[model samples]
Target: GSSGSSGTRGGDSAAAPLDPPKSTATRCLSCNKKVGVTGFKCRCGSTFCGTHRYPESHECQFDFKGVASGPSSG
Candidate 1:
């Protein structure tokens, strides 16, 4: 005759789940589509979205003023 018993070790267990947080650091000067990853910084005076291929497309009076006028031979 013989006898046997069942048992298990209780060392460590995964009790909680973890999650991550996120936020956008940048956006279009006027709108959105693609964002943080699609923003382009320009020295023309400000920023714009991927859609604005050129700074001249918007009112960049700062840079334009530096030129003294809209268009000139100077």
Candidate 2:
């Protein structure tokens, strides 16, 4: 005499495979290297790596007309 049920409760079922993780990589304008989460975006609308993250670092071509020369003496 044997038991009637011949199967595993939750182990016999096959689950769907999961998708791979997405990448958040972008190109750096200064060095042309792949930048990740630590990348910096300059006010000139250019992306830069850690080494050239500042405007002076990459010699930014942004116009400076809007920049004030000095504090107003009111």
Q: Highest lDDT, which number?
A: 2
Task: List candidate 1 segments past 4 Å from native.
Answer: 1-24, 32-34, 71-74
lDDT of 2 by residue, 1-74 (tens): 87675433443222112334332335677687766446687777667788999866676667657663543446
> Backbone collision count in every prediction?
0, 0
Report the C-alpha lDDT of model 1 over 1-74, residue by residue, as the tens digit. 89997644453321111323232234455553344544566665345676773665655545644565555334
Global lDDT scores for all candidate models: 0.49, 0.59
Q: Compared to the true structure, candidate 2 yields what TM-score?
A: 0.49
